[PDB]
Amino acid sequence: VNPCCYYPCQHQGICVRFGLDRYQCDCTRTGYSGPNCTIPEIWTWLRTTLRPSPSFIHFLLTHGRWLWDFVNATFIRDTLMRLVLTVRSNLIPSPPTYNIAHDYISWESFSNVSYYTRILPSVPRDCPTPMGTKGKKQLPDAEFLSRRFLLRRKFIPDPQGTNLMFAFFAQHFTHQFFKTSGKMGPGFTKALGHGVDLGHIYGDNLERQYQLRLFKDGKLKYQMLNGEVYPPSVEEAPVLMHYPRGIPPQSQMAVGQEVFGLLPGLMLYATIWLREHNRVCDLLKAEHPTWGDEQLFQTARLILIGETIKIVIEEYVQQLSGYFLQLKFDPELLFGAQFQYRNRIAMEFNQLYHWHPLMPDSFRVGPQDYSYEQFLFNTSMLVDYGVEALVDAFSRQPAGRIGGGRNIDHHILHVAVDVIKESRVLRLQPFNEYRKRFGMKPYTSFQELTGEKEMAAELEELYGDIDALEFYPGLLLEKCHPNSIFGESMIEMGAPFSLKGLLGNPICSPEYWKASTFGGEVGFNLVKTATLKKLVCLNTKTCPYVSFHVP
Amino acid sequence: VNPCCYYPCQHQGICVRFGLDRYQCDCTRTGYSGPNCTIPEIWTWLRTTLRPSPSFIHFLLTHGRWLWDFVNATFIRDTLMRLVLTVRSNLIPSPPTYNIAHDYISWESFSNVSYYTRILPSVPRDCPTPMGTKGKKQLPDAEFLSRRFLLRRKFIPDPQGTNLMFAFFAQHFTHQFFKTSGKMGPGFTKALGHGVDLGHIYGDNLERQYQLRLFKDGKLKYQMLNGEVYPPSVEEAPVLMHYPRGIPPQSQMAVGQEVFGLLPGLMLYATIWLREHNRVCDLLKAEHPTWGDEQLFQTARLILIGETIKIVIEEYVQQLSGYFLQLKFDPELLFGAQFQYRNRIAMEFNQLYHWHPLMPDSFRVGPQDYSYEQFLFNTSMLVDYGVEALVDAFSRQPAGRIGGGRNIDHHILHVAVDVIKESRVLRLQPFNEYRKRFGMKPYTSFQELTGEKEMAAELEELYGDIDALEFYPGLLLEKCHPNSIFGESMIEMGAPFSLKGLLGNPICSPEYWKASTFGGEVGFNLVKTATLKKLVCLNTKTCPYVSFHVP
Ligand code: HEM
Ligand code: HEM
Ligand SMILES: CCCCCCCCO[C@@H]1O[C@H](CO)[C@@H](O)[C@H](O)[C@H]1O
C-alpha cells in the first residue's frame, strides 16, 4: 500500500515515494526533522507552545471595544494589520506548487496558468479508501449528504447582520477569478489573471475587452435607458453572453463576465462598476489632456483595481470578520517584508467560497417579493428599478448564515451536490488534513466538529470516521463561533487565500504603488479613499442606504 | 515641446504629463526629492560619493589572485556574491513596467506575456529629434554606421581567451529567451517563459513539446546514427523547423527551438542537452521505480534548468567577467532578502546580447577550415564529426572580441544593421540615458567614449552630439576594460539583466529549492555540482578538451 496514503509527513513536509515500497519526507525548512518532520527545533517549539488558540485570538478581536478604539487610532493598528497580513500569507505557497495534473512541482505547473493550483496534493489514486486510509470504501451519496445536512428547512439569517448587497458583491467579485472551464474540466480556469484583475469587467481576453471598449476617452461602451447609464447591448458589444436561447442580441447586456446576465444582482454591480470606470476616465482626462484613449483606459483600470482591493479589505472583510480591529489597506505595510507579489487561485479556495447559503428564500424589493423563478433570468428588473432602488433593497434584506448547516435554499442546492461530486473528482484530501495544513488540530470526532450530537451521530454513521470527512461539508457543517456567519475553519483557511490574493497583486508592489502609476495624486486618492458608499452614490442620481450590513 | 523629451526626471523618477505643457516627476523611493528628483537624501548622498567607480572595482576584481584565493575560501565569498546578486538585481524593476505599447504601468503590460518589457520608456514620438532633444533631425544611415565602425577588417581575438564553445553556448542559451516574432513585429516575443525555462529544448508551447517527447521513461524522442544519439528527424517529430526550401524531412532535425537547424554549433548543444535529459531520466527511474513518464519528464526538466543556471553563473559568467572572485550559484544567499522570483525579458537586454563579433572569419575543425557558406545550413556536419569532435574544435578556436569596434564578419554584418534599425523602431532612448539608468555618469564626448581620436571624430560628425549616440552602437564602440572582451557598459548594464534572470527563476525560491523538487538528493546534487565538462563528457564516448576558455 502506497505509504503516502497515510499522509505521514507533518508540518508541510513533502511525501516522496522511493523504490517500490518506501517513502521519505523532505522536511526542508518546516522547523521539524525526523522521518515525519515531527521533531521540533527549539524555536519551533517555543512558537507553538506560546501560540494562543485560533479561538482565543478571535475572542480578543471581538471584545473590549473601548480597547480597540485607542488601538485603532494609533500606529498599533498598522503593526497589527501587518502581523495579520504576513502570518496569514506565509500559509500560501508562492510560487504555486501542485495542480490537478501534478502532485509535485513542475515547470508545467508553474507556467501553465490555465490550471487551478492546490495547497495539498490529491489522495493518491491507489489508496485503500477514497480519502486515503480511513472511512468506508464508499463515500456518502452527495445528494443525500446535501439534502440531509445542507438543505434549508427554515431560513436562518446571518447573526452578524450581513445583507444581500454583501452577498451579491461576493458573487460579483469572486466570479472574476473563479471561472471553471466546462470544456476543460474541473481543475481548469478561464480566469487567467488569478486575482483581482477586474476581468469580470474588462474581460478575461483582449479581443473581448476590445469589443467592450468605446475607444474614446478610454471609456467602456454603454447605452442610455430611462435616462440612466447601463452596459451596452450585445448588438453593440458583439461579445458572447450566456443567455437562455431565444433572447435576441439586442436584448442582452454585454459586461465582461459571460454569466452575469443570469442575475439582476450581478448585472447591478456590472452597471455600478461600468459607471465608475467611465467616471474615472473623466477625472483623468481633465488632469491629462494630452493622454490618448489607451492610457486613459489602462490607468482607469488600475485605479478601479485599487478601489476594489480597498473596499474588500476595509469593508467586505471587515463585515465578515466582525473584528473590533479596523482592518487597513496599505501596501506599504509589507514593504519591509519578504513577500511575493503574485498569486494563483487554488481549487480549495474555489470550493471554500461557495457561499450559496447567503441567498434568501425570495428577493424582496419594496412592496414586491420576487421568487427565484421571477428573479433568475429576468431581462428587465435591473432597468425597471434602476441602480439605487435595487441597492436599497439588497442592502435591507438579510442574507443567510453560511455555517452551521441546513441553510441552502432548495432552488440552488444542486450547486452544493456538484461541489461535493467535483471534490471527489479533484480528489481533495480530507478535512482534517486541511485543518492541519492551516495550523489547526484535527477534529477527533463529529460531535467535536458539530457543537451538537444529532447530526454528529448521523454523519458518524455515514462516514464511519471523522478523518474521512470531506473538505466542503466540513467547512459548512463546522460549529460556528458565537454570533458568527460561520466557523473558525472558514476563517483560518479562507483568510490566507484572500489576503494573499488581495496583496499578491502587482499594484501593491513597491514598483507599482506610486502616484504616477494612477495618473497622479488625484488617481492615487480615489484608490486610497474608496468606499462602497462612494462607489454607488457617486454614480447614482439619489443616494440610497448602501452597506454590507443590514440597518 | 513635450517636456518629457528633456528626460527631466533623474534617478529613475517618472516623468508625467499634466496640462498641455507641464510635467511632473514621481520621485517616490528614488532617494531624491525636488522637481527633477535631484535633491539627495542624507544616505543617498553618502552612497553616491563613497562609491568607487565601476572601473576601480573591476581593478580590484582582476588583481591579487593571492588575496582572492584566501577570500574564496572564507564566508566572505558568500558575502560578496550576495552583495553582487542584490545590488545588481535592484536595478531591474519587478514586476515589469513598460513595453512597446505602454510607456507607463498598466495591467495589460503586467499580464501580456507576449511583450518584451523595457527599462526606459521610449523616446516620445513628438520630440524635436529622433533621440529626444539632441543630435540631428536625421540619424546616421544604419548601413554606413555599421560598415564604418563595426565591419571587421582583421579578426581581433578576445584577449580573455574566450573560444567558440563559449560563443555557441551563449547563442544557444539566449535563444531560449530571445525569440522575436516576425508575425507580430518588434517588441513581441514567442519565448513566453521569459527566461531559463529551457524552451529551446522542450519547445515554447505544449503541443510542440508533446511531439518532441517519447512519452516513455519521461524521455525525449531521438534517433541513432553511427551508433550515437541525435535529436529526432522532423518525420518522427512532426515539429516546425526553419530550413531552406528543398531540404527533405529525413534531413531536418527537430529540437524545440525552431532556428537551431541553422548552425552545427547550435544543433551540437541541442544534442548534448537532449542526451543529458534522457540520462537524468535513467537516474530518476532507478530511484523511483513507481514514477511514470510525466513525473519523470517534469523532474528531469527541473534538474536541467538547475544545471543550466549552475553552469551559467559559475562557468559562463565566470569566464566573461574575468573576475578572481569565485562567483557562486546558491539560492540560499537570497533567502534573507526581499526579492521577487519572477522575470521579464527586456528589449534592451535583447539588443545588448547581440554578440555577433564572437563569430570567426571561418570555422576550423581539425585541418579542414569550413567557410560560412559551408557551415551555415550544413545538416550533415554534426553527424559527420560527432559531439566530441566538434566540442574539441570549438573549444580550441578563439572567438573575437565583443567590444572595440570593427570586429563583425561581413557574412553576418546585416544583423547589426537591423539591430540599429529596430532600435529606432523601438525608439530606444539614448546611450547616455541608459548609462544613467544603470548608475553611470554619461560620456561627455565621443573621444571619452572611445579611448581614441579618429573614430571619435567621425562619430562626432555623424551624430553631432554625444547625447544622440544610440544604445547598441554605444555598447560596441565603448572602449574596453584593460584586456577585456568588452567595455564597462556591457557589464554594468548586462549584469543586472543576467543575474535577475538567473536568480529570478522559480526553482530558486525557498518553496521550490528543496531536494524533493528534484527527485531527492540524487537530483539535487546533479544541480549543485553541474559542470560544462560533466555536461559534455558524461554524455560522449570520449572526453575531449571542453571549456569556455581556449587552451
Ligand atoms: C442567485 C443565487 C445563485 C445561483 C443561482 C448560483 C448558481 C451557481 C451555479 C449554477 C454554479 C455552477 C454550477 C455547476 O457548474 O454545476 C455556481 C458556482 C459558484 N457559485 Fe453560485 N450561485 C448563486 C449565488 C452565489 C453566491 C452568493 C456566491 C458567493 C460569492 C456564489 C459562489 C459560487 C462559486 C465560488 C461558484 C464556483 C465557480 C466556478 O468554479 O467557476 N454563488 N453558482
Ligand atoms: C553563426 C553566426 C551567426 C549567424 C549567421 C547569426 C544570425 C542571426 C540572424 C539571421 C538573426 C535574425 C536577424 C534579423 O531578424 O534581422 C540573429 C539574431 C540574433 N543573434 Fe545571431 N547569429 C550568429 C551568431 C550569434 C551569436 C554568437 C550570438 C551571441 C549570443 C547571437 C545573438 C543573437 C541575438 C541575441 C539575436 C536576436 C534575438 C531575437 O530577436 O530573436 N548571434 N542572428
Ligand atoms: C490581537 C492580536 C491579533 C494578532 C493577529 C495575527 C493574525 C492571525 O494569524 C493566524 O492566527 C491563528 C491562531 O493561532 C493561526 O492558527 C494561523 O495559522 C495564523 O495565520
Ligand SMILES: CCCCCCCCO[C@@H]1O[C@H](CO)[C@@H](O)[C@H](O)[C@H]1O
Ligand atoms: C558636506 C558635503 C556636501 C556635498 C555637496 C553636494 C551637493 C550636491 O547638490 C545637488 O547637486 C545636483 C546636481 O548638480 C543638483 O541638481 C541639486 O539641486 C543639488 O542640491
Ligand SMILES: CCCCCCCCO[C@@H]1O[C@H](CO)[C@@H](O)[C@H](O)[C@H]1O
Ligand atoms: C571588491 C568588492 C566587489 C563587490 C562587488 C559589488 C558588485 C558591483 O556592483 C556594481 O558596482 C558599480 C560601481 O560602483 C555600480 O555602479 C553598480 O550600480 C553596482 O551594481
Ligand SMILES: COC(=O)[C@@H](C)c1ccc(-c2ccccc2)c(F)c1
Ligand atoms: C487575516 O485573519 C483574519 O481573521 C481576518 C482579517 C480575515 C481575513 C479574510 C477572511 C476571509 C475568509 C473567507 C473568504 C473571504 C475572506 C476572514 F474571514 C477574516
Ligand SMILES: COC(=O)[C@@H](C)c1ccc(-c2ccccc2)c(F)c1
Ligand atoms: C554582477 O556584476 C558583475 O560584474 C559580474 C558577476 C557579472 C554578471 C553578469 C554579466 C553578464 C553581462 C551580459 C551578459 C551575460 C552576463 C557580467 F558581465 C558580469
